[PDB]
Design a binder for this molecule. Structure first.
Ligand SMILES: *[C@@H]1O[C@H](CO)[C@@H](O[C@@H]2O[C@H](CO)[C@@H](O)[C@H](O)[C@H]2NC(C)=O)[C@H](O)[C@H]1NC(C)=O
Ligand SMILES: *[C@@H]1O[C@H](CO)[C@@H](O)[C@H](O)[C@H]1NC(C)=O
Ligand SMILES: *[C@@H]1O[C@H](CO)[C@@H](O)[C@H](O)[C@H]1NC(C)=O
Ligand SMILES: *[C@@H]1O[C@H](CO)[C@@H](O)[C@H](O)[C@H]1NC(C)=O
Lengths: 211, 222, 143
């Protein structure tokens, strides 16, 4: 059984990333490292503890034997944002470590904020979804508050956040406010207020029902 | 080398599922076919594998008796059949093929996993399958627009834009489970404001479990 | 019959050689064939009568065994054919008595290329040769 600690890492571009795999019992050198980029299958990086797989850039390097293993990524770049898993093939059953998710740091970037009213088609069917988009920001922490005719909302919104972008190391986030058609038509001003480190003051985007 | 797996699936508990693994080009030299799964938020778990030259198999204990893994050496198509499905079996299942064996022990062989399929999400649920409703997120020097993909079950849906001609700037968000037990997601893209009303934007929404394919036109409102 | 194949293989030092079990640098007399413990063997054992013959794992009584040579009781009884060849557990070709019928021709058999990789570019010919008083037809691989 394989232990990867810590389960997360946050490292700056150009610097070196060091990942740890500990086996509970010797696996000699029968250990592989895989990289799993967002939404993709894992790809083999290292086998036999230290041999680079074909087509793997040389800045990926493994070492160790027995129970202590290390994957080293030299000169990190944005494309390296991923989960890395170790795996042993010394004895059956084959086992994997739990993974270490590497986030690549970048400069603070404010979200670009967009608000979208519910479509006429959806509203006709009895429900209103109001969507607020926070596009391409860093770091991941961000707050979205919905206000309906200046009344702060609670309990009627859900958020979803992308995985870190492999090219610009940003996140995007969507917040969806869900209302019945009847509640939606009782009010006029719909606003989402965005608080983020990259913003000196909170940004508000809004629309009035019916323009 | 590219491994291509059959599409996503939804199955009632107790049912069976068979996932296939096809090689893009012709078959290539490999000595073992294995299968590996990943729960939606979790890590990687080995299911079992087959060494076709010797006809041997190994399975992890959780699957002993209900999994059959096989490999068609003539077509290059591999299979995993998983039986007696339970809800805990919901997972992305990955096909893997190994090229260079590293040790053998009667009568099975082991080594690193060279090639991975893109993965097959299998959902095991007693709930009803439901295709999504797709609504435009209309645009108001960079504009944003999108498609809201509401009230479907189970995962996954895929969204492309303009039949794949538009990929830069696209964000298709992880689905969220709503209180109704149905999923919702949005897909957005940023485009030049000067393209609005001149460039056509269509989101292509695919929900394989309900065999739904929807094209939605997104344009600024009147 | 198939799981009478000893399959104790460990790439260890030399890397890659075990692929030759599945698919595709270049002289003392060998010792006579005896009883070989299956635990040291990786892949099929061939003997040469001079025609190639596979010998499966048995116990020491000759009773066939079917455990992929994984047990201490598993052996190859090779004392009788003129010689035998196999791969040992760490990738070394072993001979007792290779199966050369000529200074430049070797008996051909499914694992010739694995056991004798320096004959990869030899050509296969249907030949006939006199062993003792017995003509034999076989396929040979020649320089
Ligand atoms: C497989 O064959 C090789 C070659 O004979 C064995 O390696 C020899 O082992 C002895 C005992 O330790 C050494 O004294 C020799 O120097 C080794 N020779 C070489 C070339 O390394 C090896 O031990 C055999 N493996 C098994 C499992 O029997
Ligand atoms: C494989 O082994 C099993 C038990 O070890 C035996 O019953 C079976 O006959 C063997 N198969 C072949 C084809 O020899
Ligand atoms: C195989 O050999 C390695 C060293 O080359 C050793 O550590 C291991 O214990 C051996 N047995 C295996 C991998 O089953
Ligand atoms: C080795 O032999 C014992 C008894 O002789 C048997 O129980 C065991 O299953 C054998 N090993 C394997 C791998 O079959």
């Amino acid at each position: 059984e394989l232990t990867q600690s810590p389960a997360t890492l946050s490292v700056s571009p150009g610097e070196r990333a060091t990942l740890s795999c500990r086996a509970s019992q010797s696996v000699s050198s029968n250990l592989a490292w895989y990289q799993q980029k967002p939404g993709q299958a894992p790809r083999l990086l290292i086998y036999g503890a230290s041999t680079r797989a074909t087509g793997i850039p040389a800045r990926f390097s493994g070492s160790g034997s027995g129970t202590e293993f290390t994957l080293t990524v030299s000169r990190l770049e944005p494309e390296d944002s991923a989960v890395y898993f170790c795996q042993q093939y010394y004895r059956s059953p084959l086992t994997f470590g739990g993974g270490t998710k590497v986030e690549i740091k970048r400069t603070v970037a404010a979200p670009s904020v967009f608000i979208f009213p519910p479509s006429d088609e959806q509203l006709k069917s009895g429900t209103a979804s109001v969507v607020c988009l926070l596009n391409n920001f860093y770091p991941r922490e961000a707050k979205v508050q919905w206000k309906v005719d200046n009344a702060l909302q609670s309990g009627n919104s859900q958020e979803s956040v992308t995985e870190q972008d492999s090219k610009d190391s940003t996140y995007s986030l969507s917040s969806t406010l869900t209302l019945s058609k009847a509640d939606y038509e009782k009010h006029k001003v719909y606003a989402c207020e965005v608080t983020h480190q990259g913003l000196s003051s909170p940004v508000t985007k809004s629309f009035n029902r019916g323009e | 080398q590219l491994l291509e797996q059959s599409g996503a699936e939804v199955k009632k508990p107790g049912s069976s599922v068979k996932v296939s693994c096809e090689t893009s080009g012709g078959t290539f030299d490999n000595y073992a076919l294995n299968w590996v799964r990943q729960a939606p938020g979790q890590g990687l778990e080995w299911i079992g594998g087959v060494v076709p030259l010797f006809g041997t198999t190994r399975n992890a204990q959780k699957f002993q008796g209900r999994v059959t893994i096989s490999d068609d050496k003539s077509t290059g198509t591999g299979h995993m059949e998983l039986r007696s499905l339970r809800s805990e079996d919901t997972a992305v299942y990955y096909c893997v093929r190994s090229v260079t064996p590293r040790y053998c022990g009667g009568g099975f062989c082991y080594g690193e996993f060279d090639y991975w399929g893109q993965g097959t999400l299998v959902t095991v649920s007693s709930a009803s399958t439901k295709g999504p409703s797709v609504f435009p997120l209309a645009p108001s020097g960079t504009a944003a627009l999108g498609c809201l993909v509401k009230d479907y079950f189970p995962e996954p849906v895929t969204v492309s834009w303009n039949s794949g001609a538009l990929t830069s700037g696209v964000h298709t968000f992880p689905a969220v489970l709503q209180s109704s037990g149905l999923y919702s997601l949005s897909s957005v893209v940023t485009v030049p404001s000067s393209s609005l009303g001149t460039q056509t934007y269509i989101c292509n929404v695919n929900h394989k479990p309900s065999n739904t394919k929807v094209d939605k036109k997104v344009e600024p409102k009147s | 019959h198939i799981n009478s194949t000893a399959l104790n293989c460990n790439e260890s030092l030399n890397t890659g050689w075990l692929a030759g079990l599945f698919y595709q640098g270049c002289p003392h007399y060998p010792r006579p064939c005896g009883i070989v413990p299956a635990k040291s063997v990786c892949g099929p054992v061939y003997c040469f009568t001079p025609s190639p013959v596979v010998v499966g794992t048995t116990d020491r009584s000759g009773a066939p065994t079917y455990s992929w040579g994984a047990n201490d009781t598993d052996v190859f009884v090779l004392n009788n054919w003129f010689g035998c060849t196999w791969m040992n557990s760490t990738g070394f070709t072993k001979v007792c008595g290779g199966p050369w019928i000529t200074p430049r021709c070797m008996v051909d058999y499914p694992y010739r290329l694995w056991h004798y990789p320096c004959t990869i570019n030899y050509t296969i010919f249907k030949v006939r040769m006199y062993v003792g008083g017995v003509e034999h037809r076989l396929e040979a691989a020649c320089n």
